[PDB]
Nucleic acid binder design. Structure first.
Lengths: 473, 418, 473, 418
DNA sequence: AAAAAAAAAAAAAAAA
DNA sequence: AAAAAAAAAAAAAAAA
RNA sequence: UUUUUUUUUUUUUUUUUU
RNA sequence: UUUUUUUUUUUUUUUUUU
């Protein structure tokens, strides 16, 4: 008679110290933790594209009603929720003629055309930063849809419309955000399809991206992303113990240089003196030779862990008491020997692996709905399954469409109490500042580490890259 | 004394704004009374509203909207509030709140056209701050600001009718229990007696070549047909091993590692599963790494098993329910299963284009909810069953493994209702 | 019977298109041109120094009465004048222990100690920019007075208190602002003496910097500087004709490298399409060999003028019709040949020199007051004297203390109408965004060019430096 | 109808805030009436205020401050406004404005303690916005917002009593006109007849060696004393040049450039000026580039010239008025002069420390205004005069230059009054 | 050149 | 090595 | 890339056996 | 360096003459 245990839903704090399980509801009623007086948004792109951006902005200036309020809360307006007013006036605009895209997009070489467009935007945005007396908080760059479908790998330019670098990758968004790291400019990439799509229609006469039933949700998430980029903290946690650093390790591939080189990246989260929390990337990207190792040598292990322990120390003053190393691939003893060498005796190092590979699927007796989000199948003291994706009552709909796939949590090394680690992951699945969602299907440290690694693998000239998430998500 | 607030609105239409206004006014330190504030109703609220307006209400707040402009109940509470306005001799009593842009000031109610209204059409925050500034202007009674009561009533009233509840529920899985295993695993001393440049996949029973020993659970002389040289093997040369301790993991030797010994078992189980489903005469589709097996149109009665449909018709393409089996020994001895869907243009040849296959599969899964998935999976599992309670994998002349046809049952103490 | 002509006082525009001769009065009544929603001020320095900064900030949050309102308008508060609220809350603070200054200030080598302190502040501010999710508009760095009197050249460290690089200059403020150019961080250097000085007393028991009679004025000018650094435009002009670029040339010395090398810098001002104006530095610093030449070779002349003409063209679209080259040293034909080579035929190039060297002093018959600001003694069609410093009725006091010294305006080359050029200089003496003053004693192009040259001569590793005044004044 | 505003305040003390409030209320589109709004007064304003309150005032605004709390006039207009409050039957008529933090709400006037007041103590902008929100709340009559009238009345009322005015004024300068020059400039053919390793500064009359020609205006045989070899020079070897055309600039030759020919003149004038002031027996102080000359204590009667003091006593140091002369020929033929001040500890030896000298000079100049500077400068110029209307520079036996003792007069058509 | 456990990059689409 | 007509860097101080 | 989720495509590496 | 203004210190260069 095997038993299933459920972890109570984690509580995330809001302004004035109130708590709410759903980020959207708590942010709507209680607002963001800090007070942002205004957002000076910069817009760059086609002059025609400015009209759609202004229409969307003054559309979201007004309350928005979605299809079903119980499934997803409606969007009431940026100022009502964020206590920060952000209108279409006062925006700094730099014009980008469609002809400029025409010269460079209509190029046979994919990498060359991607580099040309990225440079065409980056030089203009740098000149905007360094030329006009006007101050800009975040940059909203708008690109058409033809570029979007012809500025990525595996996109074949049709011969009838071809008119006419290799060190960088063809990934437009990642390269665009990577080349801005030296100047530390928070920017946001949009397509007018993500903007007011009602202009566009398919062959049948319907919008390709039918967002009428989700308009409130998209406004919610875009507003949340804009607020976070502007330098604001939407919400914070309350259940995380003091003196607890986590770190999240993700390995990515680099194709520009010979051999994949297995670039490694990390993200860090911990608490501060009092109640403040820090959730920042901690990346020193450590390249790993050999094609398919995914196991970094002890020297870079010592470098990484010493850097993380320091970055904790200068912020708190004392070494973390327990560290729960998060990664989605397991570790061998090679890293752990060095890790134990660099850690002090007081610190309790713990390594936890997260896996979606295992196709464990649960089946209820009756009903057309899925399982609770929060159930844990404890295999033993060292391994367990957590269903962070699925149904939760507050949102009325399963977070997935088909049968959810759980997370495979196994403590590779250390001792670790299984209940605490299965309790921390559920808490960590809420810090998705990039998307106003009730919860995420994996710990955000893994997701944001993967994102920052993808961004940092697009450029090879990066030196001491910025490690704040404003310039990444 | 009068220290309570009345807010009139269209309950079936203006729930969101009224709820927000009540929540914020309560959080700011004001005693708010509203119809949607309380959960449950009785016959007495008709008198309750009138008595609250007459005695406990110090001030009327009206939600002006197209739905609430000409609603009989809204007008009746408006009339009661207006008469209270007259007998209280307080000019700043009625405070309408216009929240609809489609309702112009020239189309509002007659009792409202002569009263100034706070604009909520453009900015809700601006309207709320105007409400505040007017309220501190009018010396309206208040308590110390505290959002604890706000969040409190938020949990007991809102989202309270549907949340997490505690009750035991039975659960199933895609895991299939294995009843039994052969008593011992046989490594036969072949050497030249088995050709070195020979493949073991085509052999009848599952068998894998490790070092020079043939790894199989079957009897030594069971491979005579595919290996005519195997007619003169001495069974005393076998190093047969008690598989039970292999599962327990107690066994260990320099000859074979327990992890490596368990490594050979799952491959044998996979080969036995493939051979058994070949015996069932079911077709296959090549996946990137695994292999999926589906059913034709006509093999089953009405292409259905039990009272459940397994193959259906959709436009000009035939979708087929398919499964993929993997053997895992780490958590438990289990023949794991998965669900996959493939399409055929005529029902006998598979479509070679991957993109259209994926599009068709996701289109058919778009409307496929919980119960249909479980029904079809369990139906196929029962179809492949050899007995009422279990099915066997043929992998030896006298050696067999029994796998339960019923998926692994699980128990959960927490569930909910639709 | 020689005659004296007076130029009418130039009119500077404010928000909603109203005009006022005095910048302080017009800014008080009509506010700044653009709307700034808030200023996220960052503070770095001693923890003790934070208290004085907060006290000054919440002091200027309130109206301030000066000694005489008619001489100088009172300071009413930041939000009342700028329509932008800026309180002590929400400020990002990084602690700097006094011991850290103790290790590095108490050093025998002046340049080494200056570099140590500058690095100690710059690394921390860069880490603040690149580490915390909080967004900062401008940085208010606070330094003590012991450092101020022992972090500059010609400052001898007393032997009894000595406890313990050469490529950079010992000028603390200039080096501090130069090393921040790569990262483009608007910053402001303060001393607590410039802050609430009432704590400090001399040997007699009185404050060293008695600012009681000037407290309103200092609050006015500090608020104006903070607003301009935050990305706001306090005021603009209305009398400048369209199609008129000016440029201002100043030569500075560089001592770090062998030979002074005579670094040259420029600042540019012109008009935009419609009513907007641009007042930005245009610096490409062109070094000039030979010790005392002050005359740059034709190659760098062509480079400078082509860059200026371009920077005009991409902002307007057509070449300037007349250019009034401003410098405070005369030019020989060497630069002018190249200048005429690069200019088109439509452009009317004019070169004007400004000199304070000539000790022409005017003497009135009676009274204890000085001359009007705006009188012009026209020597001939090519030379004139302008008294931009002196008495103006609106401020009730002479801008100078002793007898004012006029500006020597002479059109070196070109044709130029003398009335227009003597009218433009008076207009240009008002754009002192660094100090809330009624008027300045020289054209601001010369002053701001000198400032940017002083900042850019402190570092040799600068490449493509920023050219917006937010990072300079 | 009533469409005007009354604002009561302490005129000698609360001018700034009242002026600002009136200006902004006018700019926002409101008809503001105030005592300081109008420039000039008559006997009739006592009745004017009462009639405005009784008939044209729709609403009373009071500036609550420590100075205006208990002022008899302020209280009388408060009483008139209060009686208008009673007869108008408008509860929202009196709107006090508290702007002083030192005046608590428990110390305000009796007629004000029962009326809500808008807080101006912390933020003036917050108070103004509260005033606005209340005013649009009360449907107060208004016009279209226009700051043109605001700036208009700003120029006609404020800063109008003292501004730029047009009237001719006579002006002086530090420039000194030169009446006359010698008819011709002499270049003497000396060669060996003047020693090559000889300095010309110590020679009696000014003279500069250009090429091989001695540049001076004096006669050829005037240099016999310092040059005994010059007894036998032939005057026919002189290349004497008509200085008048040099000043006109018409002359030009390969022998000498006009700019270079004019270059030699200013040096000769400077040397003549130095020699003449040496003849006056005045002491000197060494400046960085120039030379400044001052007077002792006792050379002048009471160390004063005319009715003007030139040398005074300050603590233990004696300040001396000093001048420095420069000759410039570009704008006009002018012996330019400058003003410098130096200090002596005993009155006969100069202080060698530069820092204390600069500190003393700036300390003495701190209180030195316009008239004293002109008086002392003109007094010294008259002291150095050789005649009533001009003084001469001795630079030849029969050759002299006359420089006006009166500074160059200038005329300006624009001035003002104290 | 095979075998299973582990690996990331990439595209296509659907709702949230 | 002077002359003057020009050149920028630097420190000290007082009010604005 | 507003997202998230669920798939389908390939390719790769380690431990081991010849 | 919140400023601005007014000085006093030095040093330097060019055109020219020996």
């Amino acid at each position: 008679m095997k038993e299933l245990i459920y972890i109570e839903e984690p509580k995330i704090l809001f302004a004035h110290g109130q708590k709410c399980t759903d980020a959207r509801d708590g942010l709507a009623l209680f607002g963001p933790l800090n007070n942002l007086y205004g957002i000076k948004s910069g817009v760059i792109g086609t002059k025609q594209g400015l009209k759609i951006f202004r229409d969307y902005l003054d559309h979201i200036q007004k309350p928005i009603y979605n299809s079903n309020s119980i499934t997803r809360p409606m969007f009431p307006g940026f100022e009502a929720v964020f206590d920060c007013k952000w209108e279409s006036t006062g925006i700094t605009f730099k014009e980008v003629t469609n002809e400029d895209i025409g010269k460079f997009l209509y190029n046979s070489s994919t990498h060359k055309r991607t580099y040309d467009l990225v440079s065409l935007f980056i030089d203009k945005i740098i000149s905007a930063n360094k030329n006009e007396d006007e101050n800009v908080d975040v940059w909203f760059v708008i690109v058409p849809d033809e570029i979007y479908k012809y500025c990525r790998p595996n996109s074949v330019l049709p011969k009838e419309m071809v008119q006419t670098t290799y060190n960088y990758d063809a990934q437009f968004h990642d390269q665009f955000k990577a080349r801005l790291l030296k100047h530390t400019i928070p920017t946001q990439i949009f397509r007018e399809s993500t903007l007011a799509w009602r202009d566009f229609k398919n062959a049948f006469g319907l919008p390709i991206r039918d967002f009428s039933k989700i308009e409130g949700h998209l406004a919610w998430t875009i507003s949340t992303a804009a607020f976070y980029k502007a330098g604001g903290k939407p919400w914070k946690l309350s259940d995380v113990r003091n003196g607890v650093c986590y770190l999240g390790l993700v390995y990515k591939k680099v194709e520009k240089s010979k051999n994949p080189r297995n670039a490694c990246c990390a993200a860090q989260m911990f608490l501060d003196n009092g109640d403040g929390t820090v959730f920042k990337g901690e990346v020193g990207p450590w390249y790993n030779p050999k094609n398919g190792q995914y196991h970094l040598e002890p020297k870079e292990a010592k470098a990484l862990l010493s850097q993380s322990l320091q970055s904790y120390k200068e912020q708190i003053g004392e070494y973390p008491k327990e560290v729960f190393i998060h990664a989605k691939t397991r570790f061998n003893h090679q890293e752990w020997d060095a890790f134990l060498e660099v850690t002090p005796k007081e610190t309790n190092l713990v390594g936890v692996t997260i896996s979606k590979t295992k196709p464990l699927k649960l089946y209820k007796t009756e009903g057309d709905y899925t399982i609770l989000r929060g159930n844990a199948y404890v295999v033993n003291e060292r391994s367990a399954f957590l269903w962070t994706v699925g149904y939760v009552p507050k949102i009325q709909t399963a977070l997935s469409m088909e049968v959810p796939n759980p997370l495979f949590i196994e403590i590779n090394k250390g001792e670790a109490d299984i209940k605490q680690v299965l309790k921390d992951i559920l808490s960590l699945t809420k810090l998705n500042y990039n998307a106003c969602i009730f919860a995420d299907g994996e710990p955000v440290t893994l997701r944001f580490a993967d994102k920052i690694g993808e961004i940092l693998t697009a450029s090879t000239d990066i030196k001491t890259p910025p490690l704040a998430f404003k310039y990444y998500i | 004394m009068r220290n309570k607030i009345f807010i009139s609105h269209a309950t079936p239409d203006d729930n969101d704004f009224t709820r927000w206004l009540a929540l914020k006014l309560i959080g700011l330190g004001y005693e708010v009374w509203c119809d949607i504030l309380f959960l449950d109703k009785g016959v007495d609220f008709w008198s309750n509203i009138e008595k609250v307006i007459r005695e406990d209400t110090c001030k009327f707040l009206l939600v002006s909207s197209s739905y609430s402009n000409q609603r009989e109940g809204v007008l009746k509470e408006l009339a009661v509030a207006a008469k209270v306005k007259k007998q209280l001799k307080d000019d700043k009593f009625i405070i309408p709140l216009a929240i609809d842009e489609q309702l112009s000031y020239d189309d509002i109610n007659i009792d409202i056209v002569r009263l100034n209204a706070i604009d909520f059409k453009m900015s809700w925050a601006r309207g709320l701050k105007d409400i505040l500034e007017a309220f501190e202007k009018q010396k309206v009674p208040k308590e110390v600001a505290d959002a604890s009561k706000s969040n409190l009533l938020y949990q007991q009233i809102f989202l309270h009718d549907k949340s997490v509840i505690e009750k035991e529920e039975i659960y199933d899985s895609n895991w299939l229990s294995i009843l039994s295993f052969p008593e011992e695993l046989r490594f036969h001393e072949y050497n030249w007696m088995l050709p070195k440049r020979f493949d073991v996949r085509e052999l009848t029973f599952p068998a894998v070549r490790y070092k020079n020993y043939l790894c199989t659970f079957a009897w030594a002389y069971d491979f005579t047909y595919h290996l005519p040289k195997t007619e003169t093997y001495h069974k005393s040369k076998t190093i047969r091993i008690p598989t039970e301790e292999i599962l327990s993991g107690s066994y260990d030797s320099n000859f074979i590692r327990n992890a490596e010994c368990k490594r050979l078992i799952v491959q044998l189980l996979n080969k036995a599963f493939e051979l058994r489903m070949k015996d069932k005469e079911v077709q296959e589709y090549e996946m990137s790494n695994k292999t999926a097996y589906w059913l034709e149109k006509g093999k089953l009665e009405k292409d259905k098993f039990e009272k459940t449909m397994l193959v259906g018709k959709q436009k000009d393409k035939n979708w087929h329910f398919a499964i993929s089996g993997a053997s895992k020994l780490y958590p438990f001895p289990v023949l794991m299963i998965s669900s996959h869907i493939f399409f055929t243009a005529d029902g006998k040849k598979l479509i070679d284009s991957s993109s259209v296959q994926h599009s068709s599969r996701r289109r058919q899964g778009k409307n496929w909810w919980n119960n249909t998935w479980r029904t079809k999976l369990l139906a196929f599992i029962k179809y492949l069953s050899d007995d009422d309670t279990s099915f066997y994998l043929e992998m030896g002349s006298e050696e067999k493994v029994f796998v339960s046809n019923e998926p692994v049952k699980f128990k959960g103490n927490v569930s909910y209702n639709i």
